[PDB]
Design a protein around this ligand. Structure first.
Ligand SMILES: Nc1ncnc2c1ncn2[C@@H]1O[C@H](COP(=O)(O)OP(=O)(O)OP(=O)(O)O)[C@@H](O)[C@H]1O
Ligand SMILES: [Mg+2]
Lengths: 103, 503, 56, 69, 45
């Protein structure tokens, strides 16, 4: 799970000055800080499972081997990012408006 | 399997018999047994009774040998046979004790199996002399801003944690133990510190709570908890500091660095007083025997910083003294204050004044001084210490500070902000770079405009920001160990930006 | 780890029960064993002779 | 060693017990049940033969109206 | 070294402690009277 590249939250982050949206920008900065803390909290992937040592330490028959088989067959999905694409499109429209204003 | 392994154990055990030296119990009472016979017994030698209880032959009187009992005295009857082990009391030692809770004799009480100790070390070995030691230079980061800033502790220094009850001494020791996690699990060998917590005269529930706290913080894997609870006999409480000191001496001799925390040495002194009085040894001030300064002196002197010729190891001692009504002129507090290098003083008034930890920087001293600090921490701490001394000089006028001189009001504001910086939560040790960054942001006058009540929120937010976005600067400070001019400018820019954006 | 801990606890309980039965049975059995008591009167006399030879 | 050999014989007889950890102990079942209940309570609810499967969702920051040049 | 602490004047229970207690009580009796008058005037509304 490689981290997505992002630009530094420079003074341009505070240069937005949205109408009644400075609190929104501060909340976004807090979200970024919390995301950085969460990323630093744990590694990219969870630790591996010592299936051999588990089976050696598992006296139960069937309830352990089938559990390991299910864990190997277990495949947790990943979330979607449709909102990311929508926000990117909105930012593109805002950039087009900014370009027209700049012209 | 269980029956098979049990039979394997019993066949492995060999029931050998041999000659011994034995004596009869003339009189047993209050944990003191007067033994007839036993001519060839050394002083302070372990002897075992018929019932299985062990003992220590202290008084070698002509007619009888007075032995203290390592247990309840109901199991010793008049006429019982006291065998001679033939060796001075010694405790198991080594890396195998890490992660284990053991009694005063090293026996495991955590129910995690026998200790795989390969070496056996005595408890009354002499401390290293003048020549083997070296001056303390390496810091011993406790994780508390107040300690690492104003009362620094080096590796090989006896620093006292003195104060009344319910003031935070045990919390200071436990967060010092927790803080060493960042060094132990790392890679730098010369920074790892193995903690040894000795509990004296404390209920087993408290020790269990402490062990759970350490286990939740993943700090037990490098910590030894020697437990001599209040239920245990007085000799066990007397021996526990020496057992922990030997367990730390093992690390000290092998080039490793050990931290030993004698919790409630006053209770050990009480136990030794009980033993001495029951042995009819002549009493002294507060009924303590004459050799009570000797008891703590020959124990704390074993904390030392060996030179490179002897391995380069260390043993840092953190005795805990429970004063009564802040009376440091009492017998044991005076003894321990004289023996140790400095003390960390805690006050109930400061504890309930919002200054938690309750470290009284006016009374807390460190004779090793700034020599036990990193260059950056020393640089910020000199200024912070001078400014806090200036504030404490003018702290009397804070009640009527509105109608005062501009300089006095400036000093009051700076001191209030520094004091708010010194506050820290429990079980939350801070890295040295984080502490130096916070102290830099404070002493350089980046908080004077800020509201005094908002310092804590600002401190937490600034710590989160610097850890998240500016990790490179913190890493450079940690590796270099000093706040260089380029790092000074970078810190100035960062603190200015965060202060501007704080509102 | 749930199963591992349950199995370990069961193993410990079985061990303590077995040792309890053993320690409560051996003493009474050997107290009732005179034919083993008479030879236990001489398990150590040869051992005593060997020990004294070691001393001398 | 003859006493030790008798001890070994007793250990072997306990080993060969068809009932195993019975020992003619009326309270053995009650003690084992109490220990099992305590262990289950300490570890909480769990299944002897099951696998952990779950899913979750995270909603991002909602859009906030803000007009500007 | 012998030192002191906060709020040690009333702990001694001397002339100054009784003086401070009496002064506080006399001041806050007047303050309670004023607050009671204001509360009664408000409750009349
Ligand atoms: N920095 C701190 N901030 C807030 N609370 C703290 C802090 N340090 C300690 N405490 C609290 O103060 C109380 C006393 O702490 P602690 O047990 O360490 O004190 P002590 O004087 O060593 O204790 P005792 O004399 O009973 O052995 C506890 O409730 C603890 O949680
Ligand atoms: Mg305490």
């Amino acid at each position: 799970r490689k981290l997505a590249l992002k630009a530094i939250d420079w003074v341009a982050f505070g240069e937005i000055i949205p109408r009644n949206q400075k609190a929104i920008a501060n909340s976004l900065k807090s979200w970024n800080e919390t995301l950085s803390t969460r990323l630093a909290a744990l590694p990219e992937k969870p630790p591996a499972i010592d299936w051999a040592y588990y089976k050696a330490t598992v006296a139960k028959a069937g309830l352990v081997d089938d559990f390991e088989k299910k864990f190997n067959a277990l495949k947790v999905p990943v979330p979607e990012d449709k909102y990311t694409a929508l926000v990117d499109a909105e930012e593109q429209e805002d950039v087009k408006r900014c370009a027209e204003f700049l012209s | 399997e269980v029956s098979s392994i049990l039979e394997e154990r019993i066949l492995g055990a060999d029931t050998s018999v041999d000659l011994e030296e034995t004596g009869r119990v003339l009189s047993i009472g209050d944990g003191i047994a007067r033994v007839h016979g036993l001519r060839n017994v050394q002083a302070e030698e372990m002897v075992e009774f018929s019932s299985g209880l062990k003992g220590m032959s202290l008084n070698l009187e002509p007619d009888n040998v007075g032995v203290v009992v390592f247990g309840n005295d109901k199991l010793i009857k008049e006429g019982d046979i006291v065998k001679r082990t033939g060796a001075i009391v010694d405790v198991p030692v080594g890396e195998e004790l890490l992660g284990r809770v053991v009694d005063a004799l090293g026996n495991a009480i955590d129910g995690k199996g026998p200790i795989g100790s390969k070496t056996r070390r005595r408890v009354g070995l002499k401390a290293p002399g003048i020549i083997p030691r070296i001056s303390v230079r390496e810091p011993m980061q406790t994780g508390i801003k107040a300690v690492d800033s104003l009362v620094p502790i080096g590796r090989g220094q006896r620093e006292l944690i003195i104060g009344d009850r319910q003031t935070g001494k045990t919390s200071i020791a436990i967060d010092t133990i927790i803080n060493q996690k960042r060094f132990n699990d790392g890679t730098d060998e010369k920074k790892k510190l193995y903690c040894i917590y000795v509990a004296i005269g404390q209920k087993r529930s408290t020790v269990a709570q402490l062990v759970k706290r350490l286990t939740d913080a993943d700090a037990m894997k490098y910590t030894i908890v020697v437990s001599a609870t209040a239920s245990d006999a007085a000799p066990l409480q007397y021996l526990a500091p020496y057992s922990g000191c030997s367990m730390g001496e093992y690390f000290r001799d092998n080039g490793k660095h050990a931290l030993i925390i004698y919790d409630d040495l006053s209770k050990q002194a009480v136990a030794y007083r009980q033993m001495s009085l029951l042995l009819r040894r002549p009493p002294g001030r507060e009924a303590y025997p004459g050799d009570v300064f000797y008891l703590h002196s020959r124990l704390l002197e074993r904390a030392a910083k060996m030179n490179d010729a002897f391995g380069g190891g260390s043993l840092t001692a953190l005795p805990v003294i429970e004063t009564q009504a802040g009376d440091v002129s009492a017998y044991i507090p005076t003894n321990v204050i004289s023996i140790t290098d400095g003390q960390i003083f805690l006050e109930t008034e400061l504890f309930y004044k919002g200054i938690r930890p309750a470290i009284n920087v006016g009374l807390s001293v460190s004779r090793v001084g700034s020599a036990a600090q990193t260059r950056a921490m020393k640089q910020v701490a000199g200024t912070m210490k001078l400014e806090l001394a200036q504030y404490r000089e003018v702290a009397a006028f804070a009640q009527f500070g509105s109608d005062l001189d501009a300089a006095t009001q400036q000093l009051l504001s700076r001191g209030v902000r520094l004091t708010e910086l010194l506050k820290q939560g429990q079980y939350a040790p801070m890295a040295i770079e984080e502490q130096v960054a916070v102290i830099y942001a404070g002493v350089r006058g980046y908080l004077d405009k800020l509201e005094p009540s908002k310092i804590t929120k600002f401190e937490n937010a600034f710590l989160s920001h610097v850890i998240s976005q500016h990790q490179a600067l913190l890493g450079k400070i940690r590796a270099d160990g000093k706040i260089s001019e380029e790092t000074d400018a970078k810190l100035k820019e960062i603190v200015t930006n965060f202060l501007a954006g704080f509102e | 780890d749930y199963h591992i801990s349950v199995q370990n606890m069961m193993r410990q309980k079985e061990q303590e029960h077995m040792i309890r039965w053993v320690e409560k049975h051996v003493v009474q059995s050997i107290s009732a064993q005179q034919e083993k008591e008479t030879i236990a009167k001489c398990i150590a006399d040869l051992k005593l002779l060997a020990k004294k030879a070691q001393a001398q | 060693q003859k006493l030790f050999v008798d001890k070994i014989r007793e250990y072997r007889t306990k080993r060969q017990t068809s009932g195993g950890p019975v020992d003619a102990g009326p309270e053995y079942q009650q003690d084992l049940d109490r220990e099992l209940f305590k262990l289950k309570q300490m570890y909480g609810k769990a299944d002897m033969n099951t696998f952990p499967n779950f899913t979750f969702e995270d909603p991002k920051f909602e859009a906030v109206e803000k007009p500007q040049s | 070294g012998v030192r002191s602490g906060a709020g040690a004047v009333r702990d001694a229970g001397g002339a100054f402690g009784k003086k401070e207690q009496a002064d506080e009580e006399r001041y806050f009796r007047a303050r309670a009277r004023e607050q009671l008058a204001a509360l009664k005037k408000h409750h009349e509304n």
